[PDB]
Design a protein around this ligand. Structure first.
Ligand SMILES: [Mg+2]
Lengths: 147, 49, 392, 1316, 44
RNA sequence: GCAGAGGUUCUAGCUACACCCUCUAUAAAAAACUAAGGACCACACGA
DNA sequence: CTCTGAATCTCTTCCTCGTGTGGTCAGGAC
DNA sequence: GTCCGAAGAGATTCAGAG
């Protein structure tokens, strides 16, 4: 909850930081802070990423997944303490090892799939079968995921 | 794909015969693949047969 | 193309059937694979044409049991040992009669496990009798060899001519066969000829697939020998390395970078690697234009890269698409084509917008470049490969 | 105080924390380990002599002959390290052993020995490790890598969730030896303990116990509690001690003392437990059905007849109850079973146990280990007692026993290397307790269970393997105990030892090829901690667990520096301060904290010790008084970050830069950037390339000087003094009087190594950083090696960097370097290539290197001399000839196409038996001239110093003004002194002077004939000529190039200097990074680095201005002093007052290029400090300037960041990766390059490419690729001839690789036919 | 109980999970025929 | 220019993927020119 | 007791490319 | 001159229950 409050404060200070003079009285609008331009535009950087850059780093998990009771108070603009950096390295190395092994297993799965469906080639304009699929929007408890 | 020994032995003992009609098979043998710019060539070939 | 046959002094089992997952030799003879291995590798005898004596045609007996059975009947009982015994058992069995009898008891034996096993065996028998092959041919009596050029001696330095990790396997098989032939010519005692035939069978096993049974043999640098099944199965086997993924000519590689001055249907191309790519096209254009008369003269002209070569190259790359390609290609948007524009430097230049499809990262990433040659292939690249035709 | 080097450029340093332990010798893990290997270490510890003593005693059966070890000496190296690198021979030392051969008296072996003999016996060759911590095996610096493997000692693994498909977590116990058979105790999913020797076929537990000469009664007594039951005349009064009442229900009427305690339908509360205990009861009344469900413990027989009442572990029953009752056997022992307290796990194993007696157990063990052959009693017994009871096959090292006794709570530490029955039963009990909740499992990732085997230990193990082979040979020889015939040399041979050691140091799993391209790479590749190797994991066997950083890597293994890719995690690098333990674990320096106040005492701690201790963070306010103001100071609990009190802490971190490696300690502002980008930068920092002129990092870490001095790149001053004569090739150091050796003193010539090929083909070059007459001290730095500057580490260079999108040329991550970089030769890198060429023993005339080449014009013979070898310094290009090598009938070594540049040096080796040709004659002549020159240089000056020593006694009271310089130069001895014997002293010293010249000339001729000797080479080669191409590669559009904060980029366009955006002053920024790489790739440190570099260059130009136009020393001195003192609480406190007022000007000159800044990785400058440093210079505080565009000439809106990022230049150039093939070589399978596309081979249209092509529908293109462009040789040449004719036809043909497959799968009885 | 690439691999491999939900191939009344003699019974 | 040999150069050159001329059993008036080429495992990595 | 099932062992495959560094590959005796 | 892991998947054994 503190991390969420920090994120909200960081946004409410950053996305309207420009307080400009409106031919008289004072008006504030969407800021031209370059980091916020690169994040809000969708160019490079998400809201969560810029939050973990400027506000809190939130919490981060141990190797297993159970997160630390003591989170990373600091961020990347100001200095980051040694223990906080070790806790960060936990997740960083986890993700890095996972992505390498991911590329391995994903290449294997791609080969397997493309070798099970290699021979299927469209060869007729119509099959003349009334049978189809009762395709419907997917609602797995929540709202519509695919309308 | 996989288990080349198993499939080769099963094909051998069964006296299996390959009627290529497939992408990977034609790729191995090197002829036109029956999917794409070679589909017309292969439909003509199967029409002649 | 030429082959050579090794006249085995005695028939030897084929590993692809013995100690294999399909276990064809197991279903066929209706024996445990353990017992079949025992008789083949000469651990225990197997009987053929037992007749009056209690041992049937399908029994497996130890050496002491062999002596006792010899006491029971001196000659009418027969227990051949080794692969010859399996050959004889295959000969004695008739597929059609056995197949129909197995169908008969399949119709009655309703046990689900027995039903599954009998259906497997009957499928093997039917697909083996309807197919034009006898069951004797499982036991290879005549091993063929690879053509010598498909199995050569490569080097000349260090140890003059090294091996191919298969010449030594064939030499071992030949040596075992020759020693067995010498023993049969000298009528050596049956125990030593049993040992010789067993190690001949083991050598044939190693040749067929070095590593299907026991300690895979090795006499060169303490590593398993690349047997014939090794050269077929796996990634390193021919099927995947050398058939589906043949390395191609008229190809190149370089770390790629971004160029905004390019269009969407264009890609940068170093003059050096473009010249190295389209050398046949350069030769043809020079021979047509008369700047050279023979391929030797054209080779000299392009090796000196005269100024008359560059403007000819830019002439031949007017409308000639090239297939850019990233190494870890996953989707078909991972290999497009572009009209390459001749630029200086050593790096292919990729349009920025077509890096999202390529997943290009411009941090030292290298992309292979391929050149379609036949005008049908160039046109096919223009119609399908080119980036302006696969935006969706 | 500061040494003279940093006195000329004192590195500005931030960092409030006062470092208490200086950075240790970074190569200690290698050098100390190898020095421990080469030593006589008693009391177990790892030494070469230790293995000698543990293998040499040889027992002979009736031979009455034994082998005794005395001592070993390593001979002087045959060739020096540089000579070995030049030749190729291994830098080794002969292993001279003084073995003793003894034969005891025949007919009385109990007596002494009758014939002894001592001979200095050869043993083999041990490759020594040079001072830099490297091995030179095949003339290439081939460094070892220390291995991290699972330490010997019992481990109780969990193995959760996988098997039984039920989530019931079994518990397997594994006891790994150091040299033996792995032993596994595993639980059946049906809860039956199973033993697994060598992970082989599963086997029930008690067989091992029975094989220990046990019986069922003994095993049951050892493993379970016995409930005593007595036969009393009132229905066999039961006895139940009330300690077994842990949460059991009462199916009976608990009653004693005539008093009911627990009735039906109830469980005994702990209050009822203590009530029963205070009642002091033992007997109780239960229905006989209660005892029926129990199991008998001991064997019982009817003494009336002697028949077995019931065997051990036989369950009771009504009939068995009667058989007990009517037998009169009042004693009953039942097995106390309980799901919670003591589960009956061994009883069910006995139920499963097929074997009964010890002989059957041995037979079953022999069957499972060696199947087939009849398990003879002797064979099985020998197998067991040699598998787990013989020191010859199951020696747990002292570390193994230590870990074992630690994990079994036994207080003893040392012991025999074998497993006593007590050890086996203790492992059994501990595993049972693990199953019963008592005691907990341990994780392998924990650094207290993963040991580090350095070079010494691995080499010692391979040496011991060679020695056991040799002792087998010795026993074979000693079958014939000949006496007075052979000296203690013939029975052995050095061949097996040499084979084993040479294979381990050469063709081995960890004898890695050192990546010599940066001193950082040199260091970090020696501190590498590989988890691969023999006895370790593999890149594929490793799982998610072992990859991840355990919470005990803190301060022991760097979590940042790690090779990305397949071998992530496995090859982590050792952290900075983490020395290895004595046993082999990882100790890290910690500060003892007395109550209240932290002390400076350093206490190295292993991971197991660390958990118990409380470790405070280095970044805490101690101020050397401890008493952390933060009463909630962050601390490290038992592997968990948990904030503790002020007094509750016990230990504290030593320095804020402890947790990272040296490869990551270089990264400035490591606090800010993410660990992913930090790892990327620390990996691409080991891959820089020695730049033409090295340039100090404008913002470093202060410890780069340490990593540049500890490595062998920089020639360090091992002896302080004044530089007597400096030169671009040699440095002559005049030693000071204090550091003088007693007699025969003089100079210390630091012979520098000029351009020499590295391992990654870079220039190992050394530049003298001193002048003629500048003093140096101990540990000083003299010659800046590759990528070094004034003793600091300067991997890459630094230039102006601006973060803005510049017309897409820096689109995604690409760099956009200016033409100013190339113009000022800023990033040009020397690359040294090597072109070997040999002359082999060919029949009918050998290979001769002659300029008599046929079919070659005068252009070919131009660069060659009159003997077939190119002149030194010819601008050779592609295809040019360098070496003759005429073969009997033209095999001239020619420049491979593409590579260009000058040729710097040719080396002509030659073995004896062939006369050197003319060029080889000249090479030998110049080499011997150089040798004589060096020798005479160390003769003349040394003799001058010797006469000065003799002139000292001629000036110590007996000074002679002209009488000294009146006698000839060779005799400054016989003169007038006051001794009355000094005259004869001087005459005999002149005799010693003549003998001194004699020994000098003998050394000279020894070196000469060392050069003159025939260089023995590989069997069958006459003489090898090595040619050294030296290309000059520079920046071009495609060279990979990165900063230190993992900001990897590639050059996009050499932008003309005018196009580059210029600031108000007009200084064009040399590099325009892409800003959008910062947010996503979260490396915000590179912007802190950019701002600090801008401030540093601001200081540099501020002092340059007042130094360009001459300003007096006072103003410059005060400005420099203020620039150093501006820091908030910086520890450096550099004062310019103590400077000589002329070396301050030298400091300014070394500083005018920019004030070098040092920010320790985790104590770097904060916002305020860097802001104040910026404001000191005439620079904007915001750090952003208004860069006017270079082309439009218009102001850039949104002013952009400008600063001096320290951009490296990665080894991955483009001209060595710009490949293209038209048509070249082909193979047996007619693939072009097959194994290696470096032989002018085409790209591989790989497995996924055909899918990505047929997905479009490119049938014609695909058919091209895999038939006519690659395989169909007939079709390939036909289409070539077609294309050279304008026509672009195509012929499918049959792929020759498919024909190869056809013949292969047809060569195995499987008939294949292309039937139609 | 995995929600990543192994989930897609397990799906396209048609791997029956180690704890699969059991269904009835015929509609009707549920019963426990045998007295769990070794295992419980369901008769439709 | 399709099965061989010879020619002015430079041992040999007949389309060998290959470069000029002659004829079917005989050798020279003639300049640009020449060579068909190579396997398997460990390691540092890089996308 | 014999057959649906419990186990047991065993075998195949694990991104795809490169830059490259190397290491390796049948004797003496008749 | 010439010659002697993990993961699953499947095939295969025990067992335990009718
Ligand atoms: Mg990239």
């Amino acid at each position: 909850a503190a991390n969420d409050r920090v994120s909200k404060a960081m946004m409410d200070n950053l996305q309207t930081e420009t307080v400009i003079n409106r031919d008289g009285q004072e008006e504030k609008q969407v800021s031209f802070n370059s980091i916020y331009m690169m994040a809000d535009s969708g160019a490079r950087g998400s809201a969560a990423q810029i939050r973990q850059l400027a506000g809190m780093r939130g919490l981060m998990a141990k190797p297993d997944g159970s997160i630390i009771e003591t989170p990373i108070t600091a961020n990347f603009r100001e200095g980051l303490n040694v223990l906080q950096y070790f806790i960060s390295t936990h997740g960083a190395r986890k993700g890095l090892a996972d992505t390498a092994l991911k590329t391995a297993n994903s290449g294997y799965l791609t080969r397997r799939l493309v070798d099970v469906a290699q021979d299927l080639v469209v060869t007729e304009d119509d099959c003349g079968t009334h049978e189809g699929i009762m395709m419907t929007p997917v609602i797995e408890g929540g709202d519509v995921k695919e309308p | 794909f996989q288990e080349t020994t198993r499939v080769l032995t099963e094909a051998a003992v069964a006296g299996k015969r390959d009627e290529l009609r497939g992408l990977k098979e034609n790729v191995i043998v090197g002829r036109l693949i029956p999917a794409g710019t070679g589909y017309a060539y292969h439909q003509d070939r199967m029409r002649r047969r | 193309e030429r082959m050579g046959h090794i006249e085995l002094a005695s028939p030897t089992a084929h590993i692809w059937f013995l100690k294999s997952l399909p276990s064809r030799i197991g279903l066929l003879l209706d024996m445990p694979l353990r017992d079949i291995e025992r008789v083949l590798y000469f651990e225990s005898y197997v009987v053929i044409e037992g007749g009056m004596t209690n041992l049937e045609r399908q029994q497996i007996l130890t050496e002491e049991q062999y002596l006792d059975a010899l006491e029971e009947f001196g000659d009418e009982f027969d227990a051949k040992m080794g692969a010859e015994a399996i050959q004889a058992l295959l000969k004695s069995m008739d597929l059609e009669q056995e197949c129909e009898q197995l169908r008969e008891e399949l119709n009655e034996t309703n046990s689900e496990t027995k039903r599954k096993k009998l259906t497997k065996r009957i499928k093997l028998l039917e697909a083996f009798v309807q197919s034009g092959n006898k069951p004797e041919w499982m036991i290879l009596t005549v091993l063929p060899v690879l053509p010598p050029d498909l199995r050569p001696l490569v080097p000349l330095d260090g140890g003059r001519f090294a091996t191919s990790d298969l010449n030594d396997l064939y030499r071992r098989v030949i040596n075992r066969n020759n020693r067995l032939k010498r023993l049969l010519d000298l009528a050596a005692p049956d125990i030593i000829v049993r040992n010789e035939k067993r190690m001949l069978q083991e050598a044939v096993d190693a040749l067929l697939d070095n590593g299907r049974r026991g300690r895979a043999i090795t006499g060169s640098n303490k590593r398993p020998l690349k047997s014939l099944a090794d050269m077929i199965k796996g990634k390193q086997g021919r099927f995947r390395q050398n058939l589906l993924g043949k390395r191609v000519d008229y190809s190149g590689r370089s770390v790629i970078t971004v160029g905004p001055y390019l269009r969407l249907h264009q890609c940068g191309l170093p003059k050096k690697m473009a010249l190295e790519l389209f050398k046949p096209f350069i030769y043809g254009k020079l021979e047509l234009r008369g700047l050279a008369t023979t391929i030797k003269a054209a080779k000299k002209m392009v090796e000196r890269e005269e100024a008359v070569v560059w403007d000819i190259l830019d002439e031949v790359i007017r409308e000639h698409p090239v297939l850019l390609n990233r190494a870890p290609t996953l989707h078909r948007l991972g290999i497009q084509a572009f009209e390459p524009v001749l630029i200086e430097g050593k790096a292919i230049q990729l349009h920025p917008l077509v890096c999202a499809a390529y997943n290009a990262d411009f941090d030292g990433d290298q992309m292979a470049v391929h050149v379609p040659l036949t005008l049908e292939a160039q046109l096919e690249a223009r119609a399908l490969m080119m980036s302006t035709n696969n935006i969706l | 105080v500061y040494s003279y080097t940093e006195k000329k450029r004192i590195r500005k340093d931030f960092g409030k924390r006062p470092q208490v332990l200086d950075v240790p010798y970074l190569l200690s893990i290698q050098l100390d380990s190898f020095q421990k290997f080469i030593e006589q270490d008693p009391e177990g510890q790892y030494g070469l002599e230790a293995a000698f003593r543990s293998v040499f005693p040889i027992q002979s059966y009736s031979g009455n002959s034994e082998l005794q070890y005395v001592s070993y000496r390593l001979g002087e190296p045959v060739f020096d390290v540089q000579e070995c690198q030049i030749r190729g021979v291994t830098y080794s030392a002969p292993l001279r052993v003084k073995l003793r051969l003894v034969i005891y008296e025949r007919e009385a072996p109990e007596g002494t020995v009758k014939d002894i003999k001592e001979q200095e016996v050869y043993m083999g060759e041990i490759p020594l490790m040079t001072d830099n911590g490297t091995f030179v095996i095949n003339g290439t610096e081939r460094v070892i890598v220390s291995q991290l493997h699972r330490s010997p000692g019992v481990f109780f693994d969990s193995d959760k969730g996988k098997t039984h498909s039920s989530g019931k977590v079994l518990y397997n116990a594994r006891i790994i030896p150091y040299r033996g058979s792995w032993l596994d105790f595993e639980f059946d999913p049906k809860d039956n303990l199973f033993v697994r020797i060598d992970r082989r076929r599963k086997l029930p537990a008690t067989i091992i116990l029975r094989a220990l000469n046990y019986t069922t009664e003994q095993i049951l007594d050892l493993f379970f509690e016995k409930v005593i039951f007595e036969i009393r005349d009132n229905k066999l009064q039961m006895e139940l001690v009330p300690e077994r009442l842990r949460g059991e229900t009462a199916s009976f009427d608990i009653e004693a003392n005539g008093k009911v305690y627990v009735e039906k339908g109830r469980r005994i509360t702990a209050r009822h437990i203590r009530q029963l205990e205070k009642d002091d009861v033992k007997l109780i009344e239960v229905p006989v059905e209660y005892i029926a469900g129990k199991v008998v413990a001991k064997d019982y027989i009817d003494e009336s007849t002697g028949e077995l009442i019931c065997a051990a572990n036989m369950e009771l029953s009504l009939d068995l109850l009667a058989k007990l009752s009517q037998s009169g056997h009042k004693r009953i022992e039942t097995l106390f079973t309980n799901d919670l307290d003591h589960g009956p796990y061994i009883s069910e194993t006995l139920r499963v146990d097929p074997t009964n007696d010890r002989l059957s157990a041995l037979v079953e063990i022999y069957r499972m280990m060696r199947p087939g052959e009849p398990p003879t009693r002797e064979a099985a017994e020998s197998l067991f007692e040699n598998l787990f009871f013989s020191e010859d096959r199951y020696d747990l090292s002292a570390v193994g026993r230590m870990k074992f006794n630690r994990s079994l709570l036994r207080e003893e530490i040392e012991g025999s290397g074998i497993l006593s029955k007590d050890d086996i039963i203790d492992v059994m009990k501990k595993l049972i307790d693990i199953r019963n909740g008592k005691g907990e499992v341990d994780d392998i990732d924990h650094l207290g269970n993963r040991r580090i085997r350095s070079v010494g230990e691995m080499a010692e193990n391979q040496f011991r393997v060679g020695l056991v082979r040799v002792e087998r040979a010795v026993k074979e020889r000693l079958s014939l105990g000949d006496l007075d015939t052979l000296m203690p040399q013939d029975m052995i041979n050095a061949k097996p030892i040499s084979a084993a050691v040479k294979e381990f140091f050469g063709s081995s799993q960890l004898s890695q090829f050192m990546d010599q391209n940066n001193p950082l790479s040199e260091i970090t590749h020696k501190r590498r901690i590989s988890a691969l190797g023999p006895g370790g994991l593999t890149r594929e066997r490793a799982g998610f667990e072992v990859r991840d950083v355990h919470p005990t890597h803190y301060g022991r293994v760097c979590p940042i520096e790690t090779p990305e890719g397949p071998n992530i995690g496995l090859i982590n690098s050792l952290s900075v301060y983490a020395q290895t333990n004595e046993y082999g674990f990882l100790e890290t320096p910690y500060r003892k904290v007395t109550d209240g106040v932290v002390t400076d005492e350093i206490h190295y701690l292993s991971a197991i010790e660390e958990g118990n201790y409380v470790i405070a963070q280095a970044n805490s306010n101690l101020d050397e008084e401890g008493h952390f103001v933060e009463d909630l100071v962050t601390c490290r609990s038992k592997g968990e970050s948990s904030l503790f009190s002020r007094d509750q802490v016990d230990y504290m971190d030593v320095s804020t830069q402890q947790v990272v490696s040296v490869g990551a300690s270089l990264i400035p502002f490591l606090e800010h950037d993410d660990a992913n980008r930090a790892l990327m930068g620390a990996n691409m920092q080991r891959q820089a390339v020695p730049t033409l002129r090295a340039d100090k990092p404008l913002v470093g870490t202060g410890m780069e000087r340490a990593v540049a001095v500890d490595s062998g790149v920089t020639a360090v001053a091992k002896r302080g003094g004044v530089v007597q004569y400096v030169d671009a090739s040699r440095i002559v150091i005049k030693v000071n009087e204090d550091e003088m050796y007693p007699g025969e003193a003089g100079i210390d010539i630091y012979n520098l190594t000029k351009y020499t090929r590295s391992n990654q083909n870079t220039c190992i070059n050394q530049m003298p950083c001193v002048s003629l007459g500048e003093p140096v001290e101990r540990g000083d730095v003299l010659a800046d090696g590759p990528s070094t500057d004034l003793g600091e580490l300067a991997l890459g260079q630094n230039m102006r960097v601006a973060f803005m999108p510049w017309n897409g040329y820096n689109f995604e991550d690409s760099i956009l370097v200016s033409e100013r970089v190339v113009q000022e030769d800023r990033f040009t890198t020397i690359h040294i290539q090597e072109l070997a060429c040999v002359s082999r023993d060919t029949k009918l005339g050998p290979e001769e290197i002659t300029a008599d080449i046929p079919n070659v014009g005068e252009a070919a013979l131009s660069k060659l001399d009159e003997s077939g070898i190119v002149y030194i310094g010819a601008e050779v290009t592609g295809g040019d000839i360098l070496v003759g090598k005429v073969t009997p009938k033209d095999s001239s070594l020619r420049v491979p196409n593409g590579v260009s540049g000058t040729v710097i040096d040719v080396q002509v080796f030659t073995r004896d038996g062939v006369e050197k040709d003319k060029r080889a004659l000249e090479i030998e002549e110049m080499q011997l001239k150089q040798a004589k020159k060096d020798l005479s240089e160390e003769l003349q000056i040394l003799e001058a110093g010797l006469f000065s020593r003799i002139r000292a006694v001629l000036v110590a009271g007996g000074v002679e003004a002209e009488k000294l310089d009146k006698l000839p130069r060779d005799r400054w001895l016989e003169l007038g002194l006051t001794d009355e014997e000094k005259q004869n002293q001087l005459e005999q010293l002149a005799e010693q002077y003549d003998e001194l010249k004699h020994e000098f000339e003998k050394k000279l001729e020894a070196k000469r004939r060392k050069i003159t000797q025939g260089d023995d080479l590989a069997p069958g080669v006459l003489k090898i000529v090595k040619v050294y191409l030296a290309v000059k590669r520079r920046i071009q559009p495609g060279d990979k190039m990165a900063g230190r904060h993992g900001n990897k980029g590639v050059i996009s366009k050499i932008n003309p200097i005018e196009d580059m955006p210029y600031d108000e002053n007009g200084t064009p920024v040399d590099i325009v990074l892409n800003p959008l790489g910062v947010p996503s790739r979260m490396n915000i440190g590179q912007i802190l680095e950019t701002h600090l570099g801008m401030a540093a260059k601001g200081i540099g130009d501020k002092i340059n201005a007042m130094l360009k136009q001459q300003q007096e020393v006072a103003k410059l001195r005060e400005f420099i002093q203020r620039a150093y003192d501006l820091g908030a609480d910086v520890r450096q406190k550099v004062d310019l007052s103590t400077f000589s007022d002329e070396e301050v000007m030298r400091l300014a000159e070394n500083l005018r290029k920019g004030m070098p800044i040092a920010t320790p990785v985790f104590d770097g400058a904060k916002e305020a400090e860097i802001k104040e440093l910026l404001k000191l210079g005439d620079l904007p505080t915001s750090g952003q300037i208004r860069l006017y565009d270079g082309r439009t000439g218009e102001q850039f809106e949104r002013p952009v960041t400008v600063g001096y990022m320290y951009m490296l230049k990665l080894n991955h150039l483009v001209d060595d990766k710009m490949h293209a093939r038209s048509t070249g070589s082909y193979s047996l399978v007619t693939q072009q390059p097959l194994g290696g596309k470096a032989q002018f081979g085409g790209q591989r249209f790989g497995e996924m490419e055909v899918w990505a092509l047929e997905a479009y529908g490119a049938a014609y293109t695909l058919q091209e690729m895999l038939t006519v462009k690659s395989d169909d040789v007939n079709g390939r040449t036909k289409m070539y001839k077609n294309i050279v004719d304008g026509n672009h036809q195509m012929e499918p043909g049959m792929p020759e690789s498919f024909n190869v497959l056809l013949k292969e799968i047809r060569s195995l009885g499987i008939n294949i036919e292309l039937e139609d | 109980i995995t929600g990543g690439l192994p989930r897609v691999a397990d799906l396209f491999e048609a791997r029956r999970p180690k704890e699969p939900a059991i269904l009835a191939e015929i509609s009707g009344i549920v019963s426990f025929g045998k007295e769990t003699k070794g295992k419980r019974r369901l008769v439709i």
